[PDB]
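Predicting holo structure, uridine-5'-diphosphate bound.
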Amino acid sequence: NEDEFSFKIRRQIEKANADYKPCSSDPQDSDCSCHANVLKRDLAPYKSTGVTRQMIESSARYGTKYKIYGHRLYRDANCMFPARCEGIEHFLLPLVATLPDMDLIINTRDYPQLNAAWGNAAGGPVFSFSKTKEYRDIMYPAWTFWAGGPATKLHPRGIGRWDQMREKLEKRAAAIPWSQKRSLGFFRGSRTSDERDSLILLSRRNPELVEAQYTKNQGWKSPKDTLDAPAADEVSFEDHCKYKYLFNFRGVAASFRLKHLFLCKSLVFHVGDEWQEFFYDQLKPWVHYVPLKSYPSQQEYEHILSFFKKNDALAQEIAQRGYDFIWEHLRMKDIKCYWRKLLKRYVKLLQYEVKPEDQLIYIGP
Ligand SMILES: O=c1ccn([C@@H]2O[C@H](COP(=O)(O)OP(=O)(O)O)[C@@H](O)[C@H]2O)c(=O)[nH]1
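Done. Tokens:
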């Protein structure tokens, strides 16, 4: 019983860290290649045929049309989520000076647009922040890296400033050494996916093992949105760092929580393997984090937390590498250059001449 489990996890770890190769030959990643595999596989379905003017106008129904013309940025007057457009635009604007013309259909909704099961209508290309193997959407660094992530009490203008968040969590990480972190699984968040229930129910059944509560979101409808319990408070990102075992679940799509959880130097438990942001591909299970299949049971949880509470040296090794990765390969520099290479390889696919369009508004610079 306990030993069978004990080994299985150990083989999986031994196997994983034996198999691991760094995302780049040197830590500085001068050529911006760490996540180059993702943009590669993402554009691929267009390599043979290219992007037609037709495909573009068709795909325009799937998001916010950006257009770079003669090194000037143009965008649909109406952006669905104004603050999200501002997050992306912080990134597009400095590149526009050195980019050729292109048309972009950028989806600022949480959920991807181009279902591969449908055909022809959903060929693309459309840019989204999060997808699964189901979707043809091209992945980009989300708006929240600069501004427009979830608005909360602690982040009234919506969570952002990754440059600032990094310095902040880094301090808090150094201040709270591993041994001083509480040996409890931690979570605080809203019921954006029922994959989160089992941890919350377990917490109510065993608070000494799991401290996990549902918060309230702006889409709250009834008591069901917190499994009939009183809405807990938002707890800050720095305050996560006092617990050893931090859980990350998908929401509508992938959650912004993940990247922040690593910089606590706590052990990140990532549930589900479906939903991605661009950098995830290089986040390797058992190396950087503990993997958990979607819809985990209360018993899965006890066994896995019990295992790591009983293998403290091993836990710490993982927390450390997980921290180092986000630290070394998710700097603002990594974000801007992914943006850069992505658009550069994308423009090459276009089989048509980008013409200006009057209904579009001038964005900058
Ligand atoms: O107590 C909390 C609850 C949420 N968040 C952050 O606010 C965002 C929204 O999280 P929520 O669970 O509400 O939705 P998600 O985006 O995770 O599906 C995420 O980036 C969380 O990391 C936080 O820092 N503290």
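Residues 132 and 274 are 6 Å apart (CA to CA).
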